[PDB]
Design a protein around this nucleic acid. Structure first.
Length: 46
DNA sequence: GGCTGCTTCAGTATTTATACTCTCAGTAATAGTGCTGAGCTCTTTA
């Protein structure tokens, strides 16, 4: 799906900003992505 | 620049497998609750 590392980056960055409102959606798109990919796991998707 | 053929779609005729951890929360059942009366307790003296 998606490089875990870049996600660490984005979230570190929203950490730093929340240390000041919203967050980037890059990480949010990736979240949708990973949710939907897990959905196709084998116990579920049944 | 208005102009005809393809086109795509739309309308007919039972019974679903694997958290965890508090942690709280406020609730509904539930025993604590105290009456009423009354029924027996009891004695009285006429």
């Amino acid at each position: 799906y998606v490089n875990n590392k870049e996600l660490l980056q984005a979230i570190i960055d929203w950490k730093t900003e929340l240390a000041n409102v919203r967050q980037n959606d890059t990480i949010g798109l990736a979240i949708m992505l990973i949710a939907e990919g897990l959905s196709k796991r084998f116990n579920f998707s049944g």
